[PDB]
């Protein structure tokens, strides 16, 4: 693994999208993408809409699992083995998937009022789980595909809970899913003095508490956390909601938990005033606590009140999910795709970076290209480090966003 800053481009990205089920010719919008990679297997999902991306005729949602294997060029590609299609695509929301023992468990919210975040008060929590066999037996039974409505959810003080991230971890026989809890702001306890406005000239003291909701007058606040699911127990599945600690809290946002080099790491999206990247090793899981890195070089296009590089508390709900994965812990180098625009989603760039320095990076598209959601998972293949990134990209020909998958080999040698 290279650890030296350079401006010569040593990163050559390769397009692996062609193995997965994405049809460029149809003109369909491919949104709500999900990528998870663990132990040489992968889980992928998307929603395919006819027409406008944000409001279009929902056509099909797919959830699939397969093996991540070398194409034969020594470049990894994704090959599905099992694919599941819900009968009613409009209902399934916010899938999140975790791997255990030759099954891969993906946890969804069911909604008849649309996206639960946006129609929060009207939604009654319905969670369901789909497990797909990564290596399917023939006519075995429930093993190749099993669907489950989840009846018992332990959410404590929280009024409703829902999975709210792409991928999750396993510890032993216990699965942890990234999730979010809706708590009525009357119940929310926050001492406004905590909110740091010291060098923020324009920011009022209460802004942080107000920013816990989508609106200053929002009925709920959003707290990130995990849903814990113990396979060792019997009977009806029980899901327990673990809340994140208040160290450096922001609005509950799409978040990802993953094991790298033995230990778990956590990434939470910045949809609030703090635009700086939030990721770190986790001290403890059941009393969830993360050691956020004090990163000062990577941020998120902010679209107005909370623009990139903002550190001052303001009331805003805006941003995009752009995550990174940790290739080396001793130097804490991490790899991820970010968008180099202060106010707009554009210019996606893949980078290998440290807390205060960007070692080396390569752009994935032309300067005009619009991009939105980026998901990055790294793994080690044939004793070499590879990173897969999924990038939502915009096609001028159809005013539609479709996903693109790149494989990038982290280079051991900086010179070439």
């Amino acid at each position, epitope marked *: 693994i290279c650890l030296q800053k350079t401006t010569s481009t040593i990163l050559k990205p390769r397009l692996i999208s062609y193995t997965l089920p994405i049809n460029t010719r149809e*003109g369909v919008c491919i949104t709500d993408p999900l990528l998870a990679v663990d132990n040489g297997f992968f889980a992928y999902s998307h929603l395919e809409k006819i027409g406008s991306c*944000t409001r279009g005729i929902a056509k099909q949602r797919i959830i699939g699992v397969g093996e991540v294997l070398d194409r034969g060029d020594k470049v990894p590609s994704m090959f599905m083995t099992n694919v599941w299609t819900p009968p009613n695509p409009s209902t399934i929301h916010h899938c999140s998937s975790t791997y255990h023992e030759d099954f891969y468990y993906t946890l969804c919210a069911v909604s008849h009022v649309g996206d639960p975040i946006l129609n929060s008060t009207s939604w009654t929590e319905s969670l369901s789980l789909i497990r797909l066999a990564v290596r399917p037996k023939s006519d075995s039974g429930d093993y190749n595909q099993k669907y489950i409505a989840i009846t018992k959810v332990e959410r404590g003080k929280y009024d409703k809970v829902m999975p709210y991230g792409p991928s999750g971890i396993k510890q032993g026989d216990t699965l942890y899913f990234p999730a979010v809890g809706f708590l009525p702001r009357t119940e929310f306890q926050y001492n406004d003095s905590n909110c740091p406005i010291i060098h923020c000239k324009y920011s009022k003291a209460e802004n942080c508490r107000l920013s816990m909701g*989508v609106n200053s007058k929002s009925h709920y606040i959003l707290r990130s956390g995990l849903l814990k699911y113990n396979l060792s127990l019997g009977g009806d599945i029980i899901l327990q909601f673990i809340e994140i600690a208040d160290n450096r809290l922001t609005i509950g946002s799409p978040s990802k938990i993953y094991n790298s080099l033995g230990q778990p790491v956590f990434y939470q999206a910045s949809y609030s005033w703090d635009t700086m990247i939030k990721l770190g090793d986790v001290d403890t899981v059941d009393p969830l606590r993360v050691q956020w890195r004090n990163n000062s070089v990577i941020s998120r296009p902010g679209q107005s009140q909370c623009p990139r590089f903002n550190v001052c508390p303001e009331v805003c*709900w805006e941003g*995009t999910y752009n995550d990174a994965f940790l290739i080396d812990r001793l130097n804490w180098v991490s790899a991820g795709v970010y968008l180099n625009s202060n106010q707009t*989603a554009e210019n996606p760039v893949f980078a290998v970076f440290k807390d205060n320095e960007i070692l080396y990076q390569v752009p994935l598209a032309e300067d005009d290209t619009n991009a939105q959601k980026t998901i990055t998972d790294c793994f080690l293949l044939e004793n070499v480090i590879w990173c897969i990134s999924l990038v939502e990209i915009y096609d001028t020909g159809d005013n539609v*966003i479709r996903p693109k998958l790149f494989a990038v080999k982290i280079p051991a040698q900086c010179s070439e």
Partner: antibody
Amino acid sequence: QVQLKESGPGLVAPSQSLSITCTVSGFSLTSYDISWIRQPPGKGLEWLGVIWTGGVTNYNSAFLSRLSISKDNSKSQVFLKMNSLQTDDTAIYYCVREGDWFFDVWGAGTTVTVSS
Amino acid sequence: DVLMTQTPLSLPVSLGDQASISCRSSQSIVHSNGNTYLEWYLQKPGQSPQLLIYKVSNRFSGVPDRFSGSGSGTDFTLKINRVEAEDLGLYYCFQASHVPYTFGGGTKLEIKR
């Protein structure tokens, strides 16, 4: 229920910037895309641009050099900025809620005159 | 960059009659999805435009059944039979199929009396 209101300067000096703010009521900007459309004195409606919920913005290539659209989901507002505004540009500017690539709800309109 | 051209610049018509407006597109207006995204908008005097027809022939909600749209290739026609007084103003056709979004010149409907 649903409404779109534009506040505009009314008068803009030549070769100077135009700023219009659209305040939306009755829905969230996170769940609908928003377009800016203008109609000059006798000329047909002309499509200026669109901002998606995610923040994706696409513009009419004609105006790309001097036009930019942003939004504030928390304040339910959408912003149009235009640079180097000239005589040609005097018109009625409409804030418009998009559906499936059509315009279901139109703002009242703001009338912008470019004169010294 | 797709030109929309409306054929009758004024259409005068008496109540109870049928009015036909035509829209012609410089190039093919069919999307990759295969839907054709051609819409018809009415701007009544002293008012903002209102959508009438979407996807060539579908009537936007609240639009009475006498409004009818149809098209083939690059030729589209909107027909208002049983014209009423309310129905006067500017009629526009528009395309969302291609990225520059382009509108028609306009057609002013005039009611004979």
